[PDB]
Chains A and B, each alone.
With several copies, the nearest count.
Chain A
Amino acid sequence: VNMDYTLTMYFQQAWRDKRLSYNVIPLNLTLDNRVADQLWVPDTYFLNDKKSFVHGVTVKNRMIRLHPDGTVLYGLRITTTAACMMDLRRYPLDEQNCTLEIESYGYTTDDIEFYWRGDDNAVTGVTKIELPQFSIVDYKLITKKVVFSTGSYPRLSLSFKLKRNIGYFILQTYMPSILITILSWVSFWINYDASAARVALGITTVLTMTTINTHLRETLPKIPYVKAIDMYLMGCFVFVFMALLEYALVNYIFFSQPARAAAIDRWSRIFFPVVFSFFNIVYWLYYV
């Protein structure tokens, strides 16, 4: 609904400052996290973040760590709510791909150079991420030099590929509609003389379907195209409407010729499940 995703990371940077070089003590100094306000640290910013913060309990969660040759390590514990523009034309059978662009703000590419440390073991802890709905399929690290009207700045990109699990939706939104259609099919085994029973069936089914559809469409944002679940619900609603209008056609020509009515009822009993199974199969084969 917000087209974003929140991730908490241990973001570490390592540069080489020749002015912070000492050759008296042989140990890797670890200073308090408050001396970082007196050194130079690169002006790194995430381009597609919306709300982020360095965790500040019990202190400002940052690490500064010098080395006897000038190398400086500088870690933070960030929680970025990055922007994740999603293509929901296959929802919920969709694979999303949204990134985390790490760019330097002030310094052009002739003043700073970004590179992943290790280039494949730079980003760790991805195979331990357990999401409740999605499931990380792949992740990639990219290195570019973007161009703005003020220069050409370096950029790193960390990109995931989230494949949505379909168990929850099969449980919540496909099965109720399928079983409501099965219930609607009951209106054919009732004798065509019953006028209240069959009507009850078809009308309760129609209302239930439309209600379900609107509720599910609300749980998502105002997306202007037809998702996959919307296509399934529209197909189920077409099947229900057709069942109701077939009861109505039977009731129209019942008094005139009941033989044709019984023939139509048998034909319906035979050919509603077949067409529904064919539509269901072509659906689950076009999207999966």
Chain B
Amino acid sequence: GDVTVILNNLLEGYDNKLRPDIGVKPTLIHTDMYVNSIGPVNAINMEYTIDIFFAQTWYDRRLKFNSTIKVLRLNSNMVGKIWIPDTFFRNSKKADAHWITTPNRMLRIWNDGRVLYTLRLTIDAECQLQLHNFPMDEHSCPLEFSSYGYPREEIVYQWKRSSVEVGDTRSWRLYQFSFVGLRNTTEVVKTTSGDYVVMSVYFDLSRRMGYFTIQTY
């Protein structure tokens, strides 16, 4: 009906290569997560699998419409036509989105230009476990993400109050370990390209003594 007219007017004269406020101020992006399951923490490879619902929300004064409907709810058919921040996880050995049955993405454009972009990810993050005190060892190893091409002067990330919210913590594949908590952190790192805003989520794992207690001791 008229939603087609709105969507056509939003993409008329729209350049998805220029971040919102390209030459005014940095783009503030609020990031939230939802940890479905923290996969097996195999010490041999110093890696661990995690499955999350990464949500990013920012303001885009170009996707600003004025109609009776307050929010536009869309699937992944309009994700490749607007600007989308290039958030990548800096300590991921291999990570990939989900595509069955349809690309697992969500796009919600509010009335004042506020965009919400949500996707499902399975990240094989890396953390060098200091295997001393084994098996009486405790680890707290992170998941770091940041923009790739946009330095601190262009894209600034910022956690929400209630950003990271774990699931049930019972049907996870944490066999030898045990989830005890998490904490979010924001810093600024220096790279050959520029200064980047690096966000981190630290998960605290405590190795329960059972498998090794009955296998070797």
Q: Check A-B contact in the complex, CB < 8 A.
A: yes
Chain A residues with CB under 8 Å of chain B are 8, 10, 12, 25, 27, 29-35, 55-59, 61-65, 73, 75, 77, 79
The chain B residue sitting closest to A56, CB to CB, is B96
Residue of A29, A56, A61 most packed against chain B (CB within 10 A)? A61
On whether the beta carbons of B88 and A31 are closer than 8 Å, the reply is no
The chain B residue sitting closest to A64, CB to CB, is B149
Please name the 7 residue pairs, one residue from A and one from B, whose CB atoms are nearest each other, closest first: A63-B149, A32-B17, A57-B95, A59-B86, A31-B17, A61-B88, A30-B149
For the complex, is B18 an interface residue (Cβ under 8 Å from A)?
yes
A75 — which chain B residues lie within 8 A by C-beta?
A: 148-149, 193
Q: Known A32-B16, A75-B193; judge A57-B23 contact (CB<8 A).
A: no
A56 — which chain B residues lie within 8 A by C-beta?
A: 96
Min CB gap B87→A, angstroms? 5
On whether the beta carbons of B192 and A58 are closer than 8 Å, the reply is no
Residue of A56, A57, A75 most packed against chain B (CB within 10 A)? A57
On whether the beta carbons of B193 and A65 are closer than 8 Å, the reply is yes
A59 — which chain B residues lie within 8 A by C-beta?
A: 84, 86-88, 148
On whether the beta carbons of A57 and B192 are closer than 8 Å, the reply is no
Residue of B16, B119, B148 most packed against chain A (CB within 10 A)? B148
Min CB gap B1→A, angstroms? 31
On whether the beta carbons of B18 and A62 are closer than 8 Å, the reply is no
- Chosen A-B contacts, 22 in total, with CB atoms closer than 8 Å, are A10-B191, A10-B192, A12-B192, A12-B193, A27-B23, A30-B19, A30-B151, A30-B154, A32-B16, A35-B17, A55-B95, A56-B96, A57-B92, A57-B95, A57-B96, A57-B121, A57-B123, A58-B119, A58-B121, A62-B148, A62-B149, A65-B193
Min CB gap B127→A, angstroms? 14
For the complex, is B157 an interface residue (Cβ under 8 Å from A)?
no
On whether the beta carbons of A57 and B149 are closer than 8 Å, the reply is no
For the complex, count residues of B whose C-beta is within 8 A of A.
Answer: 30
On whether the beta carbons of A25 and B23 are closer than 8 Å, the reply is yes
Complex: A28 Cα to B214 Cα, angstroms: 61
For the complex, is B59 an interface residue (Cβ under 8 Å from A)?
no
On whether the beta carbons of B89 and A57 are closer than 8 Å, the reply is yes
On whether the beta carbons of A77 and B193 are closer than 8 Å, the reply is no
Q: Known A12-B193, A25-B23, A57-B97; judge A34-B17 contact (CB<8 A).
A: yes
A64 — which chain B residues lie within 8 A by C-beta?
A: 149
Complex: A35 Cα to B149 Cα, angstroms: 13
A77 — which chain B residues lie within 8 A by C-beta?
A: 88, 148
A10 — which chain B residues lie within 8 A by C-beta?
A: 191-192
Additional pairs, 6, CB under 8 Å, beyond known A57-B123, A58-B119: A55-B88, A57-B92, A62-B148, A73-B193, A75-B148, A75-B149
Min CB gap A59→B, angstroms? 5
On whether the beta carbons of A32 and B193 are closer than 8 Å, the reply is no
The chain B residue sitting closest to A34, CB to CB, is B17
On whether the beta carbons of A58 and B149 are closer than 8 Å, the reply is no
A65 — which chain B residues lie within 8 A by C-beta?
A: 149, 193
B61 — which chain A residues lie within 8 A by C-beta?
A: none
Complex: A63 Cα to B147 Cα, angstroms: 10
On whether the beta carbons of B87 and A58 are closer than 8 Å, the reply is yes
Residue interface bits B56-98, CB-to-A below 8 A is 1, else 0: 0000000000000000000000000001101111001111110
B95 — which chain A residues lie within 8 A by C-beta?
A: 55, 57
Min CB gap B148→A, angstroms? 6
A12 — which chain B residues lie within 8 A by C-beta?
A: 192-193
Residue interface bits B109-144, CB-to-A below 8 A is 1, else 0: 000000000010101000000000000000000000
A73 — which chain B residues lie within 8 A by C-beta?
A: 193
The chain A residue sitting closest to B151, CB to CB, is A30
For the complex, is B48 an interface residue (Cβ under 8 Å from A)?
no
B89 — which chain A residues lie within 8 A by C-beta?
A: 57
B159 — which chain A residues lie within 8 A by C-beta?
A: none
Complex: A34 Cα to B19 Cα, angstroms: 13
A58 touches which of B18, B23, B97, B151 (Cβ 8 Å): B97
The chain A residue sitting closest to B91, CB to CB, is A8
On whether the beta carbons of B149 and A33 are closer than 8 Å, the reply is yes
For the complex, is B179 an interface residue (Cβ under 8 Å from A)?
no
On whether the beta carbons of A63 and B193 are closer than 8 Å, the reply is yes
For the complex, is B54 an interface residue (Cβ under 8 Å from A)?
yes
On whether the beta carbons of B92 and A55 are closer than 8 Å, the reply is yes
